Design a binder for this molecule. Structure first.
Ligand SMILES: O=C(O)COCCN1CCN([C@@H](c2ccccc2)c2ccc(Cl)cc2)CC1
Ligand SMILES: O=C(O)COCCN1CCN([C@H](c2ccccc2)c2ccc(Cl)cc2)CC1
Ligand SMILES: [Cl-]
Ligand SMILES: [Cl-]
Ligand SMILES: [Cl-]
Ligand SMILES: [Cl-]
Length: 580
């Protein structure tokens, strides 16, 4: 009868209110926290009224009708969100579709800076307001953040403050926990954004494929029917959360967690620990669960997929099913491959069949299909071993620098902050992945690279600057990483004309945190590449070394500014000659 009552009843007031605040914060990213609280309280009041009597007027309205109506009441909607006011002239589902089209992925809001004393003060003063504000701040900064996961992270955030405010030293307890929390927020936001991107740009089939591969790796003991069930249910969960239907997404996600845990013996031995936890914890634990051991009875795949005489008939009859089973089977056997590698392998299997089945003697043609995968496997494996070597040789900062040079050459039209961000993000991937046991390096590296490349692609939709990026971001998802890897110096670029102030430093650099100091230097690096795009990476590193020496020296000087002013122009002029 009443959907709003149904969800209120299923989720309870706490989670209902939390998720509604998330939904609204994500749709309306600029309003103050206090204004969103009021919309949430009103919506909740109405849900309670409807729960008491579902036949009361408007109670039987859809959630989109009710929530879209609520959003469209907000003060200063024309002035703050000119685009969203336009959406408010439409009915559902056109209105919601309009709301979705107009979410902002890079709202450029100030960085969230921990103030241990004033925050612990606010936490004690009003814990509920303090935690809601956390939901709001993160939600408006990550408009596709997986709703229920944000409630999970809010409870961690709560645990951090409960542990660390009563202690003697606040900042020493807190700042490591909050820095770790922030990193987990970023990773999580990137994973989910890839999911929503994949729905948006490649459709539901791509999400399902991705998911078949990854879930088969994690749960290799499960049969194709179980994996398919879970994939079907999890795809629906992510489709709902990506479309802003957070209440339905949360309810369906809880049902999925329940199902997995009731069938854990047939799904995976690694689920036991997850399944003895509370709800949000349980879902999160399942989501991050480690891959199960390979079962000793995994089937030989040649008979069914290369040697059977009727593969063309079975392929022709039920393409999406035959290929799905292939993907399930190959993936469960290959936790050592990345998901995109498995998707490339599946596409090569398909293409081999389309070719062989239109020739005279298909069996003799498709008998070698598995051997077609060999080159697909070896390229990424070599690329990872190669980059983990550079990483172990030079350490994180220089690895970052090398990637900055590499990506700036590929796409020098991209903004310097974005180029630095991606280079820095991919350098951190080396830190994480290269330290792992070697068989895990490939999936770790390539799965994380996908997240960073997707971030680049998302930015590029909003701020297009390069046709080569556009092609890599919009041709097949499986080929995205190879496409980016195959880009070379955009020769079409006209070297950015020299501006000396771009390479001019001052003494304020000396007061910066180390990371911020590095970002300054890395920004200069990217700018050096834009002005001298044919310079070798070794020329660029030599010049960057001189910039570092100069900053370290002038920051150690008695008269820092006099140092920077006398030495800066020399360095700048010298560096042009060094980059020829
Ligand atoms: O749709 C087209 O553009 C032309 O038709 C190609 C149809 N194939 C079907 C198989 N499909 C892959 C595929 C999709 C997305 C990324 C890689 C492979 C797939 C494998 C297993 C599963 Cl369960 C679902 C889909 C790729 C496209
Ligand atoms: O007043 C009482 O008797 C004690 O009840 C407090 C109930 N609160 C309501 C606000 N809830 C906030 C909240 C604050 C502001 C807006 C929406 C929800 C919330 C914070 C974190 C998560 Cl994970 C979920 C909910 C928490 C529970
Ligand atoms: Cl996001
Ligand atoms: Cl689709
Ligand atoms: Cl994972
Ligand atoms: Cl160095």
């Amino acid at each position: 009868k009443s959907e709003i009552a149904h969800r209120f009843n299923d989720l309870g007031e706490k989670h209902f209110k939390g998720l509604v605040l998330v939904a609204f914060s994500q749709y309306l990213q600029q309003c103050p926290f206090e204004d969103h609280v009021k919309l949430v309280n009103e919506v909740t009041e109405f849900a309670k009224k409807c729960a008491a009597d579902e036949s009361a007027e408007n109670c039987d309205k859809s959630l989109h009708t009710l929530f879209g109506d609520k959003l469209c009441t907000v003060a200063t909607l024309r002035a703050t969100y000119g685009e969203l006011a336009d959406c408010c002239e439409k009915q559902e589902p056109e209105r919601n579709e309009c709301f979705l089209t107009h979410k902002d992925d890079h709202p450029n809001l100030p960085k969230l800076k921990p103030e241990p004393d004033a925050q612990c003060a606010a936490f004690q003063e009003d814990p509920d307001k303090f935690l809601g504000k956390y939901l709001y701040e993160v939600a408006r900064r990550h408009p596709y953040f997986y709703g229920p996961e944000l409630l999970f992270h809010a409870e961690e955030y709560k645990a951090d403050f409960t542990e660390c405010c009563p202690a003697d030293d606040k900042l020493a307890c807190l700042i490591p926990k909050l820095d770790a929390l922030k990193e987990r927020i970023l990773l999580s936001s990137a994973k989910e954004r890839l999911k929503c991107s994949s729905f948006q740009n490649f459709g539901e089939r791509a999400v399902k494929a991705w998911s078949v591969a990854r879930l088969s790796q994690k749960f290799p003991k499960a049969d194709f029917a179980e994996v398919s069930k879970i994939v079907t249910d999890l795809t629906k969960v992510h489709k709902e959360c990506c479309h802003g239907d957070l209440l339905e997404c949360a309810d369906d996600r809880a049902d999925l967690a329940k199902y997995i845990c009731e069938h854990q013996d047939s799904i995976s031995g690694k689920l036991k620990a997850c399944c003895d936890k509370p709800l949000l914890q349980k879902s999160h634990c399942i989501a991050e669960v480690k891959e199960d051991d390979l079962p000793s009875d995994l089937p030989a795949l040649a008979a069914d997929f290369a040697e059977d005489k009727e593969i063309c008939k079975h392929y022709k009859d039920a393409k999406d099913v035959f290929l799905g089973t292939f993907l399930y089977e190959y993936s469960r056997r290959h936790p050592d491959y990345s998901v995109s590698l498995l998707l490339r392998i599946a596409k090569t299997y398909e293409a081999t069949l389309e070719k062989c089945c239109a020739e005279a003697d298909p069996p003799a043609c498709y008998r070698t299909v598995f051997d077609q995968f060999t080159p697909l496997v070896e390229e990424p494996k070599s690329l990872v071993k190669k980059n983990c070597d550079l990483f172990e040789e030079v350490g994180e900062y220089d690895f970052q620098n090398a990637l900055i040079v590499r990506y700036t050459k590929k796409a020098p039209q991209v903004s310097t902050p974005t180029l630095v961000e991606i280079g820095r993000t991919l350098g951190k991937v080396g830190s994480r992945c290269c330290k792992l046991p070697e068989s895990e390096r490939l999936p770790c590296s390539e799965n994380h690279l996908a997240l960073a490349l997707n971030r680049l692609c998302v930015l590029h939709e909003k701020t297009p600057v390069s046709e080569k990026i556009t092609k890599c971001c919009t041709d097949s998802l499986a080929e995205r990483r190879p496409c980016f890897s195959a880009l070379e110096l955009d020769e079409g670029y006209v070297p950015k004309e020299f501006k000396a102030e771009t390479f001019t430093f001052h003494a304020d650099i000396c007061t910066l945190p180390e990371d911020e100091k590095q970002i300054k230097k890395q920004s200069a690096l990217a700018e050096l590449v834009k002005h001298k795009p044919k310079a070798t990476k070794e020329q660029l590193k030599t010049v960057l070394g001189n910039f570092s020496a100069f900053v370290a020296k002038c920051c150690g000087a008695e008269d820092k500014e006099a140092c920077f002013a006398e030495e800066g122009p020399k360095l700048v002029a010298s560096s042009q000659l060094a980059l020829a």
